[model samples]
Target: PKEPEQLRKLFIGGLSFETTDESLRSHFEQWGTLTDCVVMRDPNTKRSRGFGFVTYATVEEVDAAMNARPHKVDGRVVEPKRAVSLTVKKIFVGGIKEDTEEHHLRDYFEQYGKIEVIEIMTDRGSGKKRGFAFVTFDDHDSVDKIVIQKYHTVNGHNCEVRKAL
Candidate 1:
């Protein structure tokens, strides 16, 4: 017993294409309060690239989650070399709508917490959304709320939410 609010953040990889932010949150929530979860994907094809992140409200929560489940997601077990540290502040979002703008995306996430920055990756030539972005929050609690409240479909695609670094 430690409380969920005492856990920290953690990095997760080797995800499946079908894994969504909602799913990730649901999985981790069983262990503790999840602050944020995101899975990276390809902008052009709208498919998962096989990696993601999960942030817990406290260090205890992070440890509980990692200990509860070995490094595996969507049936793809993560190799020890690829597992990353989850104790980070920034989180990456992928599978976004091509039409999504940086300001709009930021605005959407702001409802949950104070957003520091919203950087939408764009095709250098096409100027499209590239369907990926990085969202930074002022506090860990805000990120946790976003991860727990919404689904990947918020952006019209099944996305994963995870720590950035």
Candidate 2:
């Protein structure tokens, strides 16, 4: 089954450094009511990361935005592509070290693409991880890269990555 939210989300790129979250939302609002909008920013410097995602209330709004074409934000032309929404391409990570945390997974796997969620399975009572995890990336291609390689090292432990059932 296809994800409903994925159909209404767009990954936008080539944003001007001056573009703020408010401006991004303002531009897209002309097309439709937006559920979410942001200009990704660097954590330390607070500079625009030059890309962001915009979610519309409906898929038709997304189509209309795309049809309008040549989106310009802060005087710079931007590119908008369909977002993966992290629903279709979740992965299983095995053999993670006991001490490894969510940030470690991010440091390693984020080279592939934007990550949506990192779920390290744990024993319910003990609250201890079971040496495996579920990583959800915002784009399907990120999983392709991990699966093609098949192996990974997180926090110095030999691990494996596979598509989740």
Put down candidate 2 lDDT per residue, 47-70, tens digits, no spaces: 999999899988768767876778
Kindly list the per-residue Cα lDDT of model 1 for residues 46-123, writing each as its tens digit: 797876777776765654564455645556665212122233457778877687667667667777557888888888
lDDT, candidate 2, residue 161? 81
For model 1 the TM-score comes to: 0.42
Segments of candidate 2 deviating more than 4 angstroms: 1-3, 85-165
Total backbone collisions for each predicted model? 23, 0
Runs with alpha carbons beyond 4 Å of true place in candidate 1: 1-85, 124-126, 148-150
Q: Cα lDDT of all candidates, in order?
A: 0.64, 0.83
Candidates' RMSD to native:
15.6, 13.6
Q: Give residue 35's lDDT in candidate 1 (0 to 100).
A: 70
